[PDB]
Design a protein around this nucleic acid. Structure first.
Ligand code: W0F
Ligand code: MG
Ligand code: ZN
Ligand code: ZN
Ligand code: ZN
Ligand code: ZN
Ligand code: ZN
Ligand code: ZN
Lengths: 93, 479, 576, 45, 67, 98, 44, 87, 257, 8, 49, 82, 115
RNA sequence: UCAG
């Protein structure tokens, strides 16, 4: 039921029935590059250029296109080095 | 009879004539499921056999001819008019429908290695390479000669020793992959000597030259065709199919000692899984095995015309009972490894099996840091061009589902088309950058200080530049 | 044009950016290998030699990498390249100076792929997440990829010319990602249906049913050999079930050693009589059904698709849920090896003897067909006299077709049941259907009794010619044979007209397959594109890229789909 | 143009597409083959 | 194309028997009687001679490439 | 040149005009096996587009009894759109009606 | 550099950049003769 | 190389200014010559401009020492005599 | 804890067949002997071919294959011959190989059948089982085949060309009494040639105490070796394999301790 | 190929 | 002379028409070859109906 | 954020385990000091697994909440998912 | 192209040991013997003769992979007997059986001919 | 034009 419920929640989240088509998906206010990857492509890019839209770069497809690490799992967090723990312990090599 | 129609105006000559050329080779077609007859019609086009008796004279690309074709032991009457007996494509093979070691599971097949050693399903693959000495160029002449590394400024480090004086390798010389079959040189205009133009063997061909011919083509230029012969012993990747729609690769090859044996000493040439038969409902395969056993013992080629009404399974079974075997064709088998009788009695009989053109040697490809395309600076495409496999959009969706962001990044950026660009901080547009001069400047701002290096796929750089040429400005700002 | 380049599929936006051709990838035919574990894949030596994984030289591994460098590209466990600290790459094939071969910490030797190297294995189309799984590499001496048979079900792959793609991760970080997220044992259970994806299949399922029968008794030496192929054996031979007169083990007694740890599970065999649970002998089952495993020991029952297959509550599912993924991997592999080595002793086959039935059964099938044809004739005569009364909501033509189809379907099913009664215990069609390995009761019925009615576009065979199906039939013939009923079985052989009508039905099946592939592909792509960026944030809210809250908790309870199981509330139904 | 070898002839390679100094094996130029890629009739049109 | 030496399944030499089989067929023996007379007893061996197609005669019809 | 071009390319028309050209005619003969040669020579090609997935032109029709092989059709995107003649089928050459 | 002729099967030596025509028959289809170096064949 | 490595955090889309196109393009005065070849190979102010990009896989473009890899290419501009609608 | 003492009776002994019964033996030993017949009895067969001229319709590797499969008389010389790997000389010498030469040209109009009789050996003992003939190839007028071949010692585990036997028939428990094979319908199955039962009874009554014994053999030869000699050589070769194992095992046992 | 309610 | 027409093999206007099988062998053409194809630019082309 | 008022899960997520083990292994391959005594383990990934078991990996995970704040959990503080 | 040479099945490559004896830690008085470049032929005889010995508690043989060439034989004996002793004695007994069989087969041959 |  989780997988059915998620699709139903994404289609009815905005308050108007969002068809899983170019029209419904592209009308939602996602990033222009993410819309570009689905169906309309160049037309989406032209409209975004005309209206001065800015891509937040928070999407998975947008980060995949630019070669950056995706915000998906294993990319949600950022690892930092712990200096105090490096000092502790037996540093054999 | 009981009156149905008393006004028949025409009569069919024979109902089996509704089938076509490829479906006419199927024995007992009426005992098979329909999709399986459709599948056999397609598989029979891809089988190997002597395609034509003048194959020695012909120089065709991609010709396969089987060493020892045999005519079917169970044959249709309409096969005679198709000349299938004259030019057969396949070998009658003692086939056991059994589960032996698990290597015949799914649709694979266990084959006898000793039989393979004795000629079973051995074929020759001929590949012809054509080259034309074209003098049409104003100052370019593609002369046939043996290129010399010192004399020719353009050359390659593959072996050129094989070529004779004429630039054509002599027949009877082994050619391994990346060897020069034909050596050709284009004279180079001295704008102010030689760009190499030899032809190289397809990788892993590993054949012996059969015929080399030199003629003049329709255009009158010198034409050379070279045919390379490669023998093809069946392997554990090769695809074999019967006439009843059962296709499968060779799972493993066991020697005659390892194969199960009957009390007479007959070991199956091919072992197919019992699980193939029931779901596919190809009962014609079983009836062909029974009729083949009867035919081989009796000495007469069996009749498998589709609609006979004089040939029934019960009649075939009684005939087999006369010849000393179990009436349904089952036989007591002994395990090759241990010698103990197998508790279940295995169904063994001769069945016409074909060898399909699809072989593992032609289908194996591996790519690691090969050449890249010009336009996208991405890996090439195709086995011939050493191309990498495509990581499609469905694949990237599976990797997103996995949560493996860094494997997705390596596969879609680092493995394919890594690249670096310099981008102005003030304006997102890319900026001119001389690494050797160490001076980096952005036109349009007259700003040199504010430039940042950005790592992006080359395809993304191309996309952004194609957007710019459409007057769209994809200003990528690090902030 | 620029818009033409970007817009279409295979354009820069999708064909070169969202997906693209990649390096360090290999493809070849796949063939079976029961001996490899679930996670292992068998890679040919040439594929292994071309693909290289770069290893950083450390003080720990400098000696091993030095030996690999000395071997070079020619000897198989060699190194193709050396990458220096400066970034200079020394291709070892062309002669490197003996000075260059020397290695120091920080150099990266590109060794050939060796046994134990984690790879990602793919089969197109990649419909679901289990279609890309991480496999350990085992190098074997032929030119086909070799994967275990259980792993075929997730990939939807059989060995009839199929091919698969091999991608080698090139960094320790991405190798760890595959090892800890995408390995085959980690994805035994799918979150889609909270069931195990992989189950025992083909020979091992068919033979596990026969192994687990009450009849099966194994002598001392056969037990020795079976225990030899059990990887997790404690080394202690179980005490035989029959000590005297001759020591004889049972199939269940050996299978109990395969079962991991202490797993408690109750399932029912496919042939379980419905009345058995209510009546006596509920626990001492007369037919040896009602599989019960207590303390990881098979007390009773015959294993089949239900117990060892891809279904919820299966023994494999309970193993993954209770023992863990590693022990479950060993469970799959041990079932396969031990049962496949017993099948050498027992054996399996399919022959014509299985298709043939008793003469009484054939006469019964024929009598059912005779009376069915007579019933269809009576319906036709009623329709001609206009005595037939239209069913509400249907025309008289529709109601005639309904009644005729009901008569023919009842006859078909009754003949099928007679055929299925005729099957003996030894019948191998029944072995495969009962075990669930392949086939169905329908296939047995069509093989032995009656192929059945051939329907095209949901109706009997239509009148392609003017008012008749084929030129041989008389105009306006709505009888059973004319419109497509195939009275003969496959073993008996179809008459010519029945052959053509059967071909028409099979063509409909083929067309449906070809159409469904394309339409489903489009639907799947659109769903993924609509929902790609939705993910569980660290608030545990499910949010998209815009950070809009799709769900406040995932699935409304914040739990993942693979861990959950089917359960009964037990407070709901009872009366006050 | 191998830096350690003044006036060294670099052998072409087909497998990866690079020119490699034959006496030391250094790869000069990484992926510099790529694909590497009627004038008679009329002229430029 | 030519009669195989060594029947595939068992390995009995069957290549010396093709011309004798053809001759016995000319002598009006039935194919089964000819196979019995030649000594081929297992159905594996009989398959070799019974199903063989001698294409090498058809190939010999063509003139030699070099005289 | 017109006859040779239309045969070699497979496009049925003129060199300058490809708008009305019909592709798929004049394929290279398959010589894998004699059966493949024969079936390639006796082959029918329905003009319906492969891209269209509408199933009516693909289904086997009752009137194909004895004229077209029921079993032999390519399996894939062209199911039922490429057909092979039956053994005794003979296409009429044509005659004057006078 | 000895070419066998298709039509009359007579070997004719042809120098480089010489027309491919067999003396005594005029045929323009020549075959290069079998190489002198010998190849070992495993009977396997 | 001295420039710090940065990851794009926002992509801003907009119509390119004609003044910005003039300033940005390496070609000065526009593409005056339809022909791509002058002096044999290179045509300054033509379609194949040495400053616009690297040619022949061995040359270096005038603007930077690309060597067919480092250079990302540089844009040029054509000054249309009379304005034209963008499709 | 000791080996059973087996016995042998030879029922038939012809030029191409030996039928014998081994009694008081285990099934594993009998099956391993059967296996050694097929794969570990050494024989001399052609393994190296250099073809000088081949104008025949069959290509060169076809001719090589057919030549390899031709059986060669190896009755007594095979024990004297050494494996090519054992011999110290480079490539092949008279101690490690036998040289066969074939030169046939068709000048008559009638088709010339190149037979095994045309194979000429330098060593008199090794001859292609000629003392019809195996047909190597058929030659049209103007077609010539000249080749030189060397024959090496080997066994059938390497290649089936070195398989001494045609068919080894192994059978035990002719009337099913240990119920090793469970017949679904006992009556339908044909009785074995060695069965001792009357026609009325299809199977012998089950004997729980019995174990497989009295194994029946029928060994047929290709003519490479005398059929008696195949059996004797197999027994001797299996004994040699076990003795080599014992030597290496003794080395390992001593080294560990 | 079975019936109207089954498969073709 | 107004042009040249490609000739389908073994049709009435082909050289191979009405030739005994021995004669076909003398021309290095197979007696069993079906015909029905054009040899255009050296490749055999078949007009699919 | 403050060290107090940490709202994320105490258990280490599977993705964090993958990335931490891979990153620490890459560090070990680059001759970083190893906290855990190795019993003849040469493979960097196996040494990283040993360190993770001993909870001596010197990495702190920064978990980004959707509101923009971050919580810094040390690898030791997180309960291993195993 | 990746096909192994045929001689690899029975020829030990240099540096390979025909027999390697490794003890089994799980159970007392158990050793696991690995025989290289051998097949079911030797393994089955050795296992059978071992099973005939009253002091051998366990004896089995396993080919780990058919494509590879190796036999693994596990022998467990009672205390006061060693697995290595059992293996040696099994080989001696098999050799005795085979020699007796050869003598009797030669006698049978000589009797069948001219008798 | 085949292969899934
Ligand atoms: C089982 O499903 C597979 C997969 O879905 C994949 N596949 C195959 N063709 C296509 C295609 O055109 N387009 C897409 N997207 N996928 C495709 O192939 C399907 C089956 O096809 P089949 O039904 O022929 O398999 P047999 O039942 O025939 O197997 P035998 O007995 O021969 O081994
Ligand atoms: Mg498949
Ligand atoms: Zn700027
Ligand atoms: Zn150098
Ligand atoms: Zn035989
Ligand atoms: Zn001539
Ligand atoms: Zn530049
Ligand atoms: Zn020597």
């Amino acid at each position: 039921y989780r997988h059915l419920a998620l699709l139903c929640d994404t289609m009815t989240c905005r308050g108007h029935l969002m068809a899983i088509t170019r029209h419904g998906v592209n009308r939602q206010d996602t990033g222009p590059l993410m819309k570009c990857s689905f169906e309309e492509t160049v037309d989406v890019l032209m409209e975004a250029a005309a209206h001065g839209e800015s891509d937040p770069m928070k999407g998975v497809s947008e980060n995949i296109m630019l070669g950056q690490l995706a915000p998906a799992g294993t990319g949600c967090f950022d690892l930092l080095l712990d200096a105090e723990k490096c000092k502790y312990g037996m540093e054999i090599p | 009879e009981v009156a149905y129609c008393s006004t028949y105006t025409h009569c069919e000559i024979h109902p089996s004539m509704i089938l076509g050329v490829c479906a006419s080779i199927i024995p007992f077609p009426d005992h098979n499921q329909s999709p399986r007859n459709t599948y056999q019609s397609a598989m029979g086009k891809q089988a190997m056999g002597v395609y034509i008796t003048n194959f020695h004279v012909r120089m065709d690309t991609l010709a396969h001819v089987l060493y020892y074709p045999q005519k079917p032991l169970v044959t249709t009457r309409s096969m005679e008019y198709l000349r299938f007996r004259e030019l057969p494509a396949g070998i009658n093979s003692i086939v056991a429908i059994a589960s032996y070691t698990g290597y015949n599971q799914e649709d694979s097949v266990i084959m006898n290695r000793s039989a393979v050693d004795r000629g079973f399903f051995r074929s020759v693959f001929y590949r012809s390479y054509k080259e034309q000495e074209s003098k049409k160029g104003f100052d370019q002449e593609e002369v046939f000669e043996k290129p010399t590394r010192e004399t020719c400024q353009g050359m390659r480090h593959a072996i050129y020793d094989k070529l004779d004086d004429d630039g054509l390798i002599a027949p009877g010389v082994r050619v391994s992959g990346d060897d020069v079959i034909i050596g050709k040189t284009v004279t180079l205009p001295e704008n102010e000597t030689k760009r190499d133009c030899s032809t190289f063997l397809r990788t892993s061909e590993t054949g012996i030259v059969d015929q080399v011919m030199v003629t003049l083509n329709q255009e009158g230029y010198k034409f050379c065709k070279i045919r390379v012969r490669s023998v093809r012993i069946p392997q554990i990747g090769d695809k074999f199919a019967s006439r009843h729609g059962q296709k499968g690769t060779c799972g493993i090859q066991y020697r005659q000692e390892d194969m199960p044996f009957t009390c007479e000493g007959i070991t199956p040439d091919i072992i197919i899984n019992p699980h193939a038969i029931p779901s596919r409902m190809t009962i014609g395969h079983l009836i062909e095995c029974l009729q083949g056993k009867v035919s081989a013992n009796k000495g007469e080629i069996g009749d498998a015309t589709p609609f006979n009404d004089a040939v029934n399974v019960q009649k075939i079974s009684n005939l087999l009972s006369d010849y000393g075997y179990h009436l349904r064709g089952n036989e007591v088998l002994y395990n090759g490894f241990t010698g103990r009788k197998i508790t279940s009695q295995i169904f063994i009989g001769p069945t016409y099996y074909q060898r399909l053109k699809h072989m593992v040697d032609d289908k194996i490809h591996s790519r690691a840091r090969g050449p890249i395309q010009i336009l996208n600076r991405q890996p090439m495409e195709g086995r011939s061009r050493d191309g990498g496999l495509r990581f499609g959009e469905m694949e990237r969706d599976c990797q997103i589902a996995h949560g493996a962001a860094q494997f997705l990044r390596e596969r879609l950026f680092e493995a394919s088309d890594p690249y670096q660009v310099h981008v102005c901080n003030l304006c997102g547009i890319m900026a001119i950058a001389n690494t050797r001069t160490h001076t980096y400047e952005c036109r349009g701002c007259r700003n040199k200080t504010q430039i940042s290096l950005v790592r992006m796929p080359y395809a993304c750089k191309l996309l952004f530049q194609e957007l710019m040429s459409m007057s769209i400005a994809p200003r990528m700002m690090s902030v | 044009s620029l818009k033409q380049r970007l817009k279409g599929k295979e354009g820069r936006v999708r064909g070169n950016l969202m997906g693209k051709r990649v390096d360090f990838s290999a493809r070849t035919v796949i063939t079976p290998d029961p001996n490899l574990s679930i996670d292992q894949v068998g890679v040919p030596r040439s594929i292994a030699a071309n693909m290289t994984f770069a290893e950083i030289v450390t003080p720990f591994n400098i000696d091993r990498l030095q030996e690999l460098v000395r071997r070079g590209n020619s000897q198989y466990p060699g190194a193709k390249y050396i990458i220096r600290d400066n970034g200079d790459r020394i291709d070892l094939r062309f002669h490197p100076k003996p000075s260059d071969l020397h290695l120091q910490t920080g150099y990266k030797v590109e060794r050939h792929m060796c046994d134990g190297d984690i790879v990602i294995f793919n089969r197109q189309p990649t419909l679901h997440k289990m279609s890309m799984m991480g496999h350990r590499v085992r190098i074997l001496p032929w030119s086909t990829f070799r994967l275990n048979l259980s792993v075929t079900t997730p990939y939807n792959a059989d060995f009839d010319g199929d091919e698969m793609n091999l991608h080698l991760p090139q960094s320790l970080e991405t190798r760890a990602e595959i090892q800890e997220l995408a390995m085959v044992p980690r994805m035994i259970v799918t979150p889609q249906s909270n069931r195990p994806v992989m189950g025992i299949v083909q020979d091992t399922l068919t033979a596990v049913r026969k192994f687990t029968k009450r009849d099966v008794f194994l002598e001392r030496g056969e037990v020795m050999n079976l225990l030899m192929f059990l990887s997790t054996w404690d080394g202690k031979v179980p005490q035989p079930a029959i000590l005297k007169p001759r020591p004889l083990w049972t199939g269940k007694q050996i299978f109990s050693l395969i079962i991991p740890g202490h797993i408690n599970c109750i399932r029912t065999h496919s042939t379980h009589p419905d009345d058995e649970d209510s009546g006596p002998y509920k626990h001492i089952s007369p037919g040896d059904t009602k599989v019960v495993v207590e303390n990881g020991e098979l007390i009773m029952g015959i294993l089949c698709k239900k117990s060892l297959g891809t279904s919820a509550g299966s023994l494999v599912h309970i193993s993954y849920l209770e023992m863990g993924h590693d022990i479950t991997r060993l469970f799959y592999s041990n079932i396969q090896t031990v049962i496949n080595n017993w099948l050498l002793i027992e054996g399996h086959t399919i022959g014509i003897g299985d298709s043939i039935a008793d003469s009484k059964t054939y006469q019964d099938i024929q009598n059912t067909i005779k009376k069915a044809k007579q019933d269809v004739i009576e319906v036709i005569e009623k329709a001609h006299n206009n005595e037939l009364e239209p069913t509400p909501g249907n025309t008289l033509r529709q109601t005639f077709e309904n009644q005729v189809n009901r008569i023919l379907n009842d006859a078909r099913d009754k003949t099928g049941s007679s055929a299925q009664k005729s099957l003996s215990e030894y019948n191998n069609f029944k072995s495969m259907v009962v075990s669930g390995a392949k086939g169905s009761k329908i296939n047995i019925s069509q093989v032995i009794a009656v192929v059945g009615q051939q329907n095209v576009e949901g109706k009997r065979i239509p009148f392609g010619f003017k008012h008749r199906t084929l030129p041989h039939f008389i105009k306006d013939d709505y009888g059973p044979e004319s419109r497509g009923f195939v009275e003969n079985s496959y073993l008996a052989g179809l008459t010519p007209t029945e052959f053509f009508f059967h071909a028409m039905g099979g063509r409909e099946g083929l067309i449906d397959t070809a159409v469904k592939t394309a339409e489903t592909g489009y639907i799947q792509r659109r769903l993924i594109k609509s929902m790609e960026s939705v993910m569980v944030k660290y608030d545990a809210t499910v949010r998209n890229s815009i950070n809009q809250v799709v769900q406040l908790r995932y699935g409304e309870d914040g739990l993942a789909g693979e861990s959950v199981e089917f359960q009964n509330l037990a407070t709901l139904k009872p009366s006050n | 143009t191998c830096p350690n070898h003044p006036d060294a002839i670099l052998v072409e390679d087909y497998r990866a597409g690079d020119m490699i100094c034959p006496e030391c094996g250094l790869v000069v130029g990484d992926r510099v083959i790529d694909v590497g890629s009627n004038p008679l009739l009329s002229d430029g049109d | 194309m030519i009669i195989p030496v060594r029947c595939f399944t068992c390995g009995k030499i069957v290549g010396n028997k093709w011309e004798a089989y053809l001759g016995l067929l000319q002598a009006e023996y039935t194919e089964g009687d000819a196979l019995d007379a030649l000594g081929l007893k297992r159905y594996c061996c009989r398959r070799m001679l019974l199903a063989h197609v001698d294409l090498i005669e058809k190939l010999l019809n063509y003139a030699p490439l070099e005289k | 040149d017109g006859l040779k071009y239309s045969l070699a390319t497979g496009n049925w028309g003129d060199q300058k005009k490809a708008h009305q050209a019909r592709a798929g005619v004049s394929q290279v003969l398959n010589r894998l096996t004699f059966a493949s040669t024969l079936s390639h020579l006796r082959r029918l090609n329905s003009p319906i587009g492969r891209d269209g997935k509408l199933a009516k032109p693909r289904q086997l029709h009752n009137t194909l009894w004895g004229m077209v092989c029921p079993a032999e059709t390519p399996e894939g995107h062209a199911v039922g759109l490429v057909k092979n003649l039956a053994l005794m089928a003979y296409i009429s050459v044509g005659s004057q009606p006078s | 550099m000895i070419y066998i002729c298709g039509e009359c099967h007579t070997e004719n030596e042809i120098k480089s950049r010489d027309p491919i025509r067999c003396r005594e028959c005029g045929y323009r289809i020549m075959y290069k003769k079998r190489t002198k170096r010998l190849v070992v064949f495993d009977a396997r | 190389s001295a420039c710090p490595l940065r990851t794009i955090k926002r992509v801003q889309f907009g119509v390119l200014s004609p003044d910005e196109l003039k300033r940005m393009s390496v070609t000065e005065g526009g593409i005056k010559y339809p022909e791509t070849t002058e002096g044999g190979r290179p045509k300054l102010g033509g379609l194949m401009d040495p400053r616009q990009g690297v040619i022949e896989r061995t040359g270096r473009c005038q603007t930077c020492a690309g060597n067919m890899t480092e250079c990302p290419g540089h844009f040029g501009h054509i000054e249309l005599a009379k304005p034209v609608f963008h499709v | 804890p000791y080996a059973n003492q087996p016995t042998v009776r030879i029922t038939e002994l012809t030029d191409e067949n030996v039928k014998f019964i081994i009694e008081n033996t285990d099934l594993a030993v009998a099956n391993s002997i059967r296996r050694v017949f097929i794969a570990e009895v050494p024989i001399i067969a052609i393994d190296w071919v250099q073809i000088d001229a081949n104008s025949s319709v069959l290509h060169d590797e076809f001719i090589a294959h057919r030549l390899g499969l031709i059986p060669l008389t190896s009755d007594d010389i095979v024990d004297k011959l050494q494996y090519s790997r054992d011999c110290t000389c480079e490539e092949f010498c008279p101690e490690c190989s036998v040289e066969f030469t074939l030169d046939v040209r068709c000048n008559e109009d009638q088709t010339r059948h190149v037979t095994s009789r045309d194979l000429i050996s330098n060593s008199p003992r090794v001859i292609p089982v000629t003392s019809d003939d195996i047909l190597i190839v058929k030659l049209r007028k103007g077609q010539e085949l000249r080749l030189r071949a060397y024959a090496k010692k080997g066994f059938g585990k390497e290649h089936a060309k070195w398989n001494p036997t045609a068919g080894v028939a192994f059978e035990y428990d002719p009337d099913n009494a240990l119920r090793h094979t469970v017949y679904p319908k006992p009556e339908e199955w044909p009785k074995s040639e060695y069965s001792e039962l009357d026609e009325d009874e299809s199977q012998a009554p089950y004997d729980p105490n019995g174990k497989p014994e009295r194994f029946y053999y029928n060994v047929e030869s290709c003519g490479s070796l005398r059929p008696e000699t195949i059996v004797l050589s197999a027994l001797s070769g299996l004994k040699k394999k076990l003795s080599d194992l014992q030597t290496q095992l003794s080395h390992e046992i001593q080294s560990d301790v | 190929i079975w019936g109207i309610g089954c498969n073709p | 002379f107004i042009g040249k027409i490609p000739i389908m093999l073994r049709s009435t206007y082909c050289l191979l028409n009405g030739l005994t099988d021995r004669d076909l062998c003398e021309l290095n053409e197979c007696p069993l070859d079906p015909g029905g194809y054009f040899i255009i630019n050296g490749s055999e082309k078949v007009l699919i109906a | 954020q403050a060290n107090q008022k940490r709202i994320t899960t105490p258990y280490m997520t599977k993705y964090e385990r993958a990335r931490v083990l891979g990153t620490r292994a890459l560090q070990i391959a680059m001759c970083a000091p190893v906290m855990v005594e190795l019993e003849g383990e040469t493979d960097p990934l196996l040494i990283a697994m040993k360190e993770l078991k001993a909870r001596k990996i010197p990495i702190i995970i920064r978990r980004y909440l959707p509101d923009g704040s971050y919580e810094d959990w040390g690898v030791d503080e997180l309960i291993i998912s195993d | 192209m990746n096909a192994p040479p045929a001689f690899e099945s029975f020829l030990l490559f240099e540096g390979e040991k025909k027999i390697t004896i490794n003890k089994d830690t799980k159970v007392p008085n158990a050793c696991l013997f690995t025989i290289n470049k051998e097949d079911h032929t030797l393994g089955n005889i050795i296992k059978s003769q071992l099973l005939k010995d009253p002091q051998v508690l366990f004896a089995g043989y396993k080919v780990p992979h058919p494509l590879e060439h190796k036999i693994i034989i596990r022998v467990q004996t009672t205390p006061d007997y060693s697995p290595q002793e059992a293996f040696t004695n099994a080989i001696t007994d098999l050799i005795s059986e085979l020699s007796l069989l050869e003598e009797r087969f030669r006698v049978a041959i000589k009797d069948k001919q001219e008798g």
